[PDB]
Paper text:
Here we characterize a metal-dependent, bifunctional isoprenyl diphosphate synthase from the leaf beetle Phaedon cochleariae by structural and functional analyses. Isoprenyl diphosphate synthase in P. cochleariae (PcIDS1, EC 2.5.1.1) produces FPP in the presence of Mg2+, but preferably forms GPP when exposed to the heavy metal ions (HMIs) Co2+ or Mn2+. Inter- and intramolecular cooperative effects in the homodimer strongly depend on the provided metal ions and regulate the biosynthetic flux of terpene precursors to either biological defence or physiological development. Strikingly, a unique chain length determination domain adapts to form geranyl or farnesyl pyrophosphate by altering enzyme symmetry and ligand affinity between both subunits.
To obtain a symmetric complex with IPPHAl in both subunits, a strong ligand for the Al site like ZOL is required. This inhibitor significantly increases the thermal stability of all PcIDS1 variants apart from D319A, which prevents coordination of Mg2+B. The protonated imidazole group of ZOLAl imitates the nascent carbocation of DMAPPAl, while the central hydroxymethyl group constrains the bisphosphonate to a fixed conformation. With four negative charges, bisphosphonate resembles the eclipsed PPAl moiety and engages with all metal sites to induce IPPHAl binding in its native orientation. Thus, the binding strength of C5 ligands at the Al site correlates with the affinity for IPPHAl and promotes catalysis in both subunits. However, the enforced closed state through ZOLAl coordination does not provide information about the metal-dependent interplay between the Al and HAl sites.
Author numbering:
A (entry chain B), B (entry chain A): 85 to 429
Amino acid sequence: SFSKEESREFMAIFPDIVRDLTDAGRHTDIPEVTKRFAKVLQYNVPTGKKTRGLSTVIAYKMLEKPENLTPENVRLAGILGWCVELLQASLLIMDDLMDRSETRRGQPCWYRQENVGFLAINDCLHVESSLYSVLRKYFSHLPCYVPIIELFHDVNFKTNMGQSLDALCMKDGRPILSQFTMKRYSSIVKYKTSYYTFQLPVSLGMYLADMYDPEQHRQAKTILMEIGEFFQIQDDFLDAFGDSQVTGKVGTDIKEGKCSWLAVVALQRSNPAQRQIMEEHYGRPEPESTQIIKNLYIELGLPATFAVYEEESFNIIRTHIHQISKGLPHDLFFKIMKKIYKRDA
Amino acid sequence: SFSKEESREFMAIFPDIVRDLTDAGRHTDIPEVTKRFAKVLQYNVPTGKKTRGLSTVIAYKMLEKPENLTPENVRLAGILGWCVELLQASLLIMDDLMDRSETRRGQPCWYRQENVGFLAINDCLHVESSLYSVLRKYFSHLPCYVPIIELFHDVNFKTNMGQSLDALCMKDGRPILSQFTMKRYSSIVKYKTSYYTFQLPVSLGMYLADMYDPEQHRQAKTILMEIGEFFQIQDDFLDAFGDSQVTGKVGTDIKEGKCSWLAVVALQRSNPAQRQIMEEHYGRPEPESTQIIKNLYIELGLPATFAVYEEESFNIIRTHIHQISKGLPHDLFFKIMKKIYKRDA
Ligand SMILES: O=P(O)(O)C(O)(Cn1ccnc1)P(=O)(O)O
Ligand SMILES: O=P(O)(O)C(O)(Cn1ccnc1)P(=O)(O)O
Ligand SMILES: C=C(C)CCOP(=O)(O)OP(=O)(O)O
Ligand SMILES: C=C(C)CCOP(=O)(O)OP(=O)(O)O
Ligand SMILES: [Mg+2]
Ligand SMILES: [Mg+2]
Ligand SMILES: [Mg+2]
Ligand SMILES: [Mg+2]
Ligand SMILES: [Mg+2]
Ligand SMILES: [Mg+2]
């Protein structure tokens, strides 16, 4: 899975989605806006790695009865995966505005383009609303239609709650370091990342396979939230220690005063002098201050701590998969974990 | 219609909407965020005129069979009206960021308030998503559920297209005055205002009354698009000439270079010297340029021009209402026009 041919099949759907949203004989009185929206979609939607959309297809293929897999049902699963990518695209447009970011996917953040600015808020809302038009076109005659619409709206609401908890790291221009606990961290990640990134693809595949039992969705959730916590911890590590040419994004968490995994572990490990460095220099726009924090992270050994976590967490999650209900395919969870951890074994 | 008793009935539902979204035994691990969202709702949702929500109820009462007007079905119509008010609240949060506005509904705009700022961007999305949670709680077992959610999806998408066309007034910091025609103006207002403000309340009332005839919906739409353009022309007059203590908002259209009705009519009426004033001073950040344009609008007699237009258009719209058939109650459309004609807020 996550093969070159699966990517080919998935990518082939995107031009049809753009046609559905911008050139299907609708809104023929406002071609200026529809032609612009095609450019919004081209810049912002297909420019990532598509792990969430591809995972929606893989989940469906592993949950559906083999006999029921047809080219037509697999294409439906691919359309659902593009609906997840429309949600991702929307969330990153708004996130980059909120985080004052420079680059995304190796190009300027959308809001930084000429004649965009705060119009990016509208483009964010427009890209998310688009997915419900796609759902109506392709799924309106199936039993899974309403549960899928409701899952997208509920996951959006949850993601908004997580984005708000993430944003509340700062008050009056200074970080609330005494509240930067691992408990707070885990709550932020659950809501701002794990539901939409990991739960949504798998629950979509379950619904398209006519699996409505809330206990099956809950058994999946326990594993998927553990994978999501690693995924966001890795993101946080790379914000400070990654190469922006490889990640496609310039880090901002130290300047923005975020309750990142690095900040939480730094506060756990700091002696009183190091805690005073955090108090003085964390969450400041001055470049000296951001470099002083990075130097503290190096002094505290946080890169080795992250490398240990990447190894240990893989093995803990693999053990937990073994304990999932016999009713769910254990190999779906192993495949997701292997892709996220960039391991074949 | 728009009576004290109808207002009391409608406001009585608001505390239950807040409870539904923030205190219904959900998300009990993140009370910081749920308590803050209760404040977001309190500030941003209920302090406007509530004409859209009240119109949803009036439409339902005038479309349903009298024998079916139970406490419970009238309450459902009020809940649908609050869902339109949630959509409105979401749009205004974003709009005030995009328009760089100072006040809304008599208070500083949400994004300007202490420790809000760019958090207002997530709050806008969160308020929008919340209306679908309310629809799910109350409507999910009723035949109107899918038509209602599909209508909200479609109206959202159309509103985003209008907000985009509205924003394309300026390119590289100068207004595209050669393109400020009445044809452009009518297209902008149809999409950014008329669908969500007038079509949505009346179509919701129809759906709750189990009225699905595509031809009845189309005849209501035709008149409601005329009403929406009239209403937006009034809004544009208030931006330049309203009393901000009565309207609750300080105008920005001249500074933001908007294709307002006043700008379109100023370009139609201007001599060559007056056109050069528009070219030089429209859509500038400098207070002195905006005052030059306001003074041009005064000298052109745009207040009296608006007054004559509003009276002429009220009479044309009422002539068109008299021509409505398809079993639609003329008095619903007359009551909407009576409520807005000659408004100062
Ligand atoms: O660090 P963030 O949460 O802002 C991020 O991971 C985006 N995001 C937003 C919600 N969940 C994740 P990115 O580093 O891509 O800017
Ligand atoms: O003039 P706008 O369109 O920005 C406005 O009417 C808001 N709006 C946004 C879309 N439709 C209407 P407001 O004057 O309330 O700021
Ligand atoms: C939740 C996080 C870490 C946001 C970035 O997600 P990805 O790294 O999957 O981004 P794209 O491939 O879509 O660019
Ligand atoms: C579409 C428009 C003109 C936006 C403002 O609507 P209202 O003037 O109805 O504002 P509130 O009563 O909701 O504050
Ligand atoms: Mg970010
Ligand atoms: Mg962020
Ligand atoms: Mg990050
Ligand atoms: Mg505005
Ligand atoms: Mg506006
Ligand atoms: Mg206005």
